[PDB]
Structure formats: C-alpha cells, structure tokens
Design an enzyme around this catalytic site. Structure first.
Site, short mmCIF file in Angstrom:
data_model
loop_
_atom_site.label_atom_id
_atom_site.label_comp_id
_atom_site.label_asym_id
_atom_site.label_seq_id
_atom_site.Cartn_x
_atom_site.Cartn_y
_atom_site.Cartn_z
N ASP A 45 0.84 -1.16 0.00
CA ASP A 45 0.00 0.00 0.00
C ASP A 45 0.90 1.24 0.00
O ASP A 45 1.68 1.44 0.92
CB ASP A 45 -0.90 0.03 1.25
CG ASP A 45 -1.83 1.24 1.18
OD1 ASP A 45 -2.76 1.20 0.34
OD2 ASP A 45 -1.58 2.25 1.90
N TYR A 50 2.79 10.11 0.64
CA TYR A 50 3.78 9.50 1.54
C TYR A 50 5.21 9.90 1.13
O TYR A 50 6.10 9.76 1.96
CB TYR A 50 3.64 8.01 1.62
CG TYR A 50 2.26 7.53 2.13
CD1 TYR A 50 1.36 8.39 2.73
CD2 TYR A 50 1.88 6.19 1.98
CE1 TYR A 50 0.10 7.96 3.10
CE2 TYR A 50 0.63 5.74 2.36
CZ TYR A 50 -0.27 6.64 2.90
OH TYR A 50 -1.55 6.20 3.22
N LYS A 79 -2.65 6.00 -4.48
CA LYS A 79 -3.76 6.88 -4.15
C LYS A 79 -3.56 8.26 -4.70
O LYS A 79 -2.43 8.79 -4.68
CB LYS A 79 -3.96 6.98 -2.64
CG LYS A 79 -3.81 5.67 -1.89
CD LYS A 79 -4.24 5.75 -0.41
CE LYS A 79 -3.85 4.53 0.38
NZ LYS A 79 -2.43 4.52 0.78
N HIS A 112 -7.84 9.12 -2.46
CA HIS A 112 -7.24 9.00 -1.12
C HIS A 112 -8.19 9.49 -0.02
O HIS A 112 -8.33 8.86 1.03
CB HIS A 112 -5.91 9.75 -1.09
CG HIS A 112 -4.99 9.36 0.02
ND1 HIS A 112 -3.62 9.50 -0.09
CD2 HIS A 112 -5.24 8.81 1.25
CE1 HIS A 112 -3.09 9.06 1.03
NE2 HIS A 112 -4.02 8.64 1.88
N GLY A 215 -3.44 0.66 15.43
CA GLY A 215 -3.67 1.90 16.11
C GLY A 215 -2.72 3.01 15.74
O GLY A 215 -2.69 4.02 16.45
N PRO A 217 0.48 3.80 16.23
CA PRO A 217 1.15 4.43 17.37
C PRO A 217 2.16 5.47 17.01
O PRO A 217 2.50 6.31 17.88
CB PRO A 217 1.79 3.25 18.13
CG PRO A 217 1.90 2.21 17.09
CD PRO A 217 0.64 2.35 16.25
N1 LIG Z 1 -6.01 5.69 3.23
C1 LIG Z 1 -5.63 6.40 4.26
O1 LIG Z 1 -6.13 7.55 4.52
C2 LIG Z 1 -4.63 5.91 5.25
C3 LIG Z 1 -4.49 6.45 6.53
C4 LIG Z 1 -3.63 5.84 7.45
C5 LIG Z 1 -2.95 4.71 7.11
N2 LIG Z 1 -3.05 4.21 5.82
C6 LIG Z 1 -2.29 3.04 5.35
O2 LIG Z 1 -2.34 2.03 6.36
C7 LIG Z 1 -1.00 1.70 6.77
C8 LIG Z 1 -1.01 1.21 8.22
O3 LIG Z 1 -1.46 2.25 9.13
P1 LIG Z 1 -0.47 3.16 9.99
O4 LIG Z 1 0.83 3.30 9.32
O5 LIG Z 1 -1.27 4.35 10.33
O6 LIG Z 1 -0.26 2.37 11.36
P2 LIG Z 1 -0.26 0.84 11.91
O7 LIG Z 1 0.07 -0.11 10.80
O8 LIG Z 1 -1.50 0.67 12.68
O9 LIG Z 1 0.91 0.97 12.99
C9 LIG Z 1 2.26 1.20 12.56
C10 LIG Z 1 3.13 1.30 13.79
O10 LIG Z 1 3.12 0.03 14.49
C11 LIG Z 1 4.48 -0.39 14.71
N3 LIG Z 1 4.48 -1.82 14.53
C12 LIG Z 1 4.31 -2.50 13.34
N4 LIG Z 1 4.31 -3.83 13.53
C13 LIG Z 1 4.48 -4.00 14.91
C14 LIG Z 1 4.63 -5.14 15.66
N5 LIG Z 1 4.54 -6.38 15.21
N6 LIG Z 1 4.80 -4.96 17.00
C15 LIG Z 1 4.88 -3.70 17.52
N7 LIG Z 1 4.79 -2.58 16.83
C16 LIG Z 1 4.61 -2.75 15.49
C17 LIG Z 1 5.32 0.34 13.65
O11 LIG Z 1 6.63 0.48 14.10
P3 LIG Z 1 7.95 0.33 13.15
O12 LIG Z 1 7.56 0.71 11.74
O13 LIG Z 1 8.93 1.22 13.84
O14 LIG Z 1 8.34 -1.12 13.23
C18 LIG Z 1 4.60 1.70 13.54
O15 LIG Z 1 5.01 2.58 14.59
C19 LIG Z 1 -0.20 2.97 6.50
O16 LIG Z 1 1.18 2.81 6.58
C20 LIG Z 1 -0.76 3.30 5.13
O17 LIG Z 1 -0.20 2.44 4.16
C21 LIG Z 1 -3.92 4.78 4.90
C1 LIG Z 2 -7.88 15.13 4.31
O1 LIG Z 2 -7.12 15.74 5.36
C2 LIG Z 2 -6.00 15.12 5.76
C3 LIG Z 2 -5.66 13.86 5.21
C4 LIG Z 2 -4.50 13.25 5.63
C5 LIG Z 2 -3.64 13.80 6.56
C6 LIG Z 2 -2.40 13.17 6.96
C7 LIG Z 2 -1.99 11.89 6.30
S1 LIG Z 2 -0.99 11.96 4.95
N1 LIG Z 2 -2.50 10.78 6.78
C8 LIG Z 2 -3.52 10.72 7.87
C9 LIG Z 2 -2.23 9.47 6.14
C10 LIG Z 2 -3.14 9.24 4.90
O2 LIG Z 2 -4.01 10.10 4.66
O3 LIG Z 2 -2.90 8.20 4.27
C11 LIG Z 2 -1.54 13.76 7.89
C12 LIG Z 2 -1.93 14.99 8.44
C13 LIG Z 2 -3.12 15.63 8.10
C14 LIG Z 2 -3.99 15.08 7.15
C15 LIG Z 2 -5.19 15.73 6.75
C16 LIG Z 2 -5.56 17.03 7.34
F1 LIG Z 2 -4.66 17.96 7.14
F2 LIG Z 2 -6.74 17.51 7.02
F3 LIG Z 2 -5.70 16.95 8.66
#
Ligand SMILES: NC(=O)c1ccc[n+]([C@@H]2O[C@H](COP(=O)([O-])OP(=O)(O)OC[C@H]3O[C@@H](n4cnc5c(N)ncnc54)[C@H](OP(=O)(O)O)[C@@H]3O)[C@@H](O)[C@H]2O)c1
Ligand SMILES: COc1ccc2c(C(=S)N(C)CC(=O)O)cccc2c1C(F)(F)F
Length: 317
Positions: A45, A50, A79, A112, A215, A217
């Site tokens: 993804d 990013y 996206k 996105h 979550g 983190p």
């Molecule tokens: N479409 C959207 O608007 C949107 C928004 C948010 C996220 N996303 C996508 O979803 C993906 C995942 O969400 P996210 O990045 O927000 O967070 P997440 O996957 O919920 O959490 C990532 C965090 O968890 C840690 N971690 C990963 N595996 C672990 C494990 N086995 N044990 C302990 N800690 C672990 C990572 O640390 P380290 O990396 O330091 O190991 C990092 O700090 C994103 O990277 C992105 O591709 C999309």
């Molecule tokens: C649509 O609005 C967005 C969308 C994404 C973000 C992000 C990003 S890039 N993410 C939450 C990750 C993602 O959207 O994949 C970071 C800070 C503010 C954002 C905002 C906002 F600025 F408003 F708060």
C-alpha cells in the site's frame, strides 16, 4: 507465508495482508519492501503523499531483477491526493506515482480522501489559521479522469478511501459511471469496528481494506492517554494464549472478517511477524470479545478538514 486472497468484483485476487508505507522513511522503506517481499508479502500500500514511492519502486524493481518475485504476483496500490482532482492534475499525479514506482500499471488506484483541497504547489493548502482550503474539482471529477487510466490499461481497478456509505452511493449513482470501486480503504481495528460500513460495502460487492490496524502508534499526534491497541491487556491476553503477539491478533481479526489489512513497519523482525498470521485462528468467542471493544475511536479523524463539503466522518457510516 502467502497471504490468502480476497476476490474483487473484477475477479482479480487481492492479498489479504499487505505492507503499509505511511511514515516509512526514505532511507528505510526500500529495505522494508525488500524484507517484506522475501517474507512473502505481495500487496504493498502506497501513496503520492507519503513521498517515498520512488524507494518502494527501487525495491520492487530489484526484487523482480533478482527473480525473487514476478510483477503479476505483486499487488500494488496507490492513491490520488485531494489537491489533484482537476482533470489534468489527475493524470500528472498518477504519472508521477507510476514513474516513481517504476511500474507499467497499478493494481488499484484509490481516491485517497473524498474532500477536495485547493490545487497548487502546497500538499496541505491552509484557511488562515489552518483548516484545509477546499478545491474546485470534486472526487466525482477525479473519478472520471481515473476511469481513463483503466481504459488505457494503466490501472486494473479503481477504489476509494475514507468514504462513507453516502459517498459510495454518490459515486455508484453518478451518471455515465464506467467503473465501480473495488475497495474502500478505511481505518478499522477493535476500537473502530466499522460494522455498518463493512456490511454496506460487502452488500455492494466492495471489499474493505483496514488501515491503521495497530492503532497507528507512530502517528505524529498520538497522546499518551489515547487508546493503545498494542498495549490493550485484553488483546494481549488473547495473544498470549495463542503464543502470538498483540499485533498478530490485531491483523488476524480482519482476516476473519474477510477484510484486507495493511500493517506498516520498517523493522525487519516486525515485518516478518506481521504476515505470520495464517497458522492460528481466533475462536468465535474471541472474535465476539474483540468486536465488543468498539469505541468509535479514530486515530485519523482529520478534523482540520471537517468544514469541507465531502468531509466523510459526520455521517453515521
Ligand atoms: N487511506 C488512508 O487515509 C490511510 C491512513 C492511514 C494509514 N493508511 C495506510 O495504512 C498503513 C497502516 O497504518 P499506519 O501506518 O497508520 O499504522 P499501523 O500499521 O497501525 O501501525 C504502525 C506502527 O506500528 C508499529 N508496529 C508494526 N508492527 C508491529 C509489531 N509487530 N509490534 C509492535 N509494533 C509494530 C510500527 O513500528 P515500526 O515501523 O517502527 O516497526 C509503527 O510505529 C499505513 O502505513 C498506510 O499504508 C492509509
Ligand atoms: C484530508 O485531510 C487530511 C488527510 C490526511 C492527513 C495526513 C496523512 S498523509 N495521513 C492521515 C495518512 C493518509 O491520509 O494516508 C496527515 C496529516 C493531516 C492530514 C489531513 C488534514 F490535514 F486535514 F488533517
């Protein structure tokens, strides 16, 4: 380990676990993708915003050059960021993503966020103060430009992200619609179980991809009092039973709901652990327990955009 597939409405097969790349540093993400491919990941993804797609692209190209994987077995998602919804900008943004990824096609290309942002040089254009400035073009405008990509063989399927069911309805009702979304990528985890949205999407033949399943983190705005899935003692209790980690239980939760899930890591050992989720099963009772944890809590509520017309999170689902 080979992740299980989820069949899309196109009959394409989407691996049920993928690697997330938001917040993955340039300097670390290339290695993360290489480790992931070696560990059996095929779904990655990605996103323009990013600002690391070129390193993801290097990793993929090298793995394909080393015969570690074939392109047809990878599943690459990116996206369209909301500052690029105007027709010409859709194509330019896509072309930059594709060039950076060093690919000939994407498997899925997503809207996105539904709420449009002002076009221009800034990724995050500001009110004054800094609530988002909205844009001219809407996600429906953007979709029409994205449909071109599918006709031209540059993208196999389109999807959406952060859409409510009302927004999916708006799309599905659009006059002259050519292509339907294959997935809705939304935040989902035991504190935001998305029961109604998942019900709705599945009823329309639209898969769900769960983001931030651990979550998030590492989101910059995390506060220590915020809910913490990885340190939830009831999650840890269920993980300990299985001799698994909390993370692994949080990933497996989605698998058992037939929801695709995209945990992010740049730590090799965690990348490998996070796909080790196909040799245990949570019981019915355990699933019901974890479901009951819903708090309606969002790591990504993006309230600075809450005044925009297509802000998604005022709807019930
Ligand atoms: N479409 C959207 O608007 C949107 C928004 C948010 C996220 N996303 C996508 O979803 C993906 C995942 O969400 P996210 O990045 O927000 O967070 P997440 O996957 O919920 O959490 C990532 C965090 O968890 C840690 N971690 C990963 N595996 C672990 C494990 N086995 N044990 C302990 N800690 C672990 C990572 O640390 P380290 O990396 O330091 O190991 C990092 O700090 C994103 O990277 C992105 O591709 C999309
Ligand atoms: C649509 O609005 C967005 C969308 C994404 C973000 C992000 C990003 S890039 N993410 C939450 C990750 C993602 O959207 O994949 C970071 C800070 C503010 C954002 C905002 C906002 F600025 F408003 F708060």
């Amino acid at each position: 380990h080979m992740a299980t597939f989820v069949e899309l409405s196109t009959k394409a097969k989407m691996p049920i676990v993928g690697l997330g790349t938001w917040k993955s540093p340039l300097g670390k993400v290339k290695e993360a993708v290489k480790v992931a491919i070696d560990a059996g990941y095929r779904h990655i993804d990605c996103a323009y915003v990013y600002q690391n797609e070129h390193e993801v692209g290097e990793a993929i190209q090298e793995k394909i050059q080393e015969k570690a994987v074939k392109r047809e077995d990878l599943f690459i998602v990116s996206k369209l960021w909301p500052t690029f919804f105007e027709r010409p900008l859709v194509r330019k943004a896509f072309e930059k993503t594709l060039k950076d990824l060093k690919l000939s096609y994407l498997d899925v290309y997503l809207i996105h966020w539904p709420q449009g942002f002002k076009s221009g040089d800034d990724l995050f254009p500001k009110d004054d103060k800094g609530n988002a400035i909205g844009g001219k073009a809407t996600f429906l405008d953007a979709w029409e430009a994205m449909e071109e990509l599918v006709d031209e063989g540059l993208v196999k399927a389109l999807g959406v992200s952060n859409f409510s069911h009302f927004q999916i309805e708006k799309l599905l009702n659009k006059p002259g619609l050519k292509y339907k979304p294959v997935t809705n990528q939304v935040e989902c985890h035991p504190y935001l179980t998305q029961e109604k949205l998942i019900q709705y999407c599945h009823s329309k033949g639209i898969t769900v991809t769960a983001y931030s399943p651990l979550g998030s983190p590492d989101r910059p705005w995390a506060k220590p009092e915020d809910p913490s899935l990885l340190e939830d003692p009831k999650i840890k209790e269920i993980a300990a039973k299985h001799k698994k980690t909390a993370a692994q239980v949080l990933i497996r939760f989605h698998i058992q709901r037939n929801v695709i899930v995209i945990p992010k890591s740049v730590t090799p050992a965690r990348i490998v652990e996070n796909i080790q989720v196909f040799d245990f099963k949570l019981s019915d009772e355990e699933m019901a327990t974890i479901l009951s944890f819903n708090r309606n809590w969002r790591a990504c509520n993006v309230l600075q955009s809450s005044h925009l017309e297509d802000y998604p999170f005022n709807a019930e689902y």
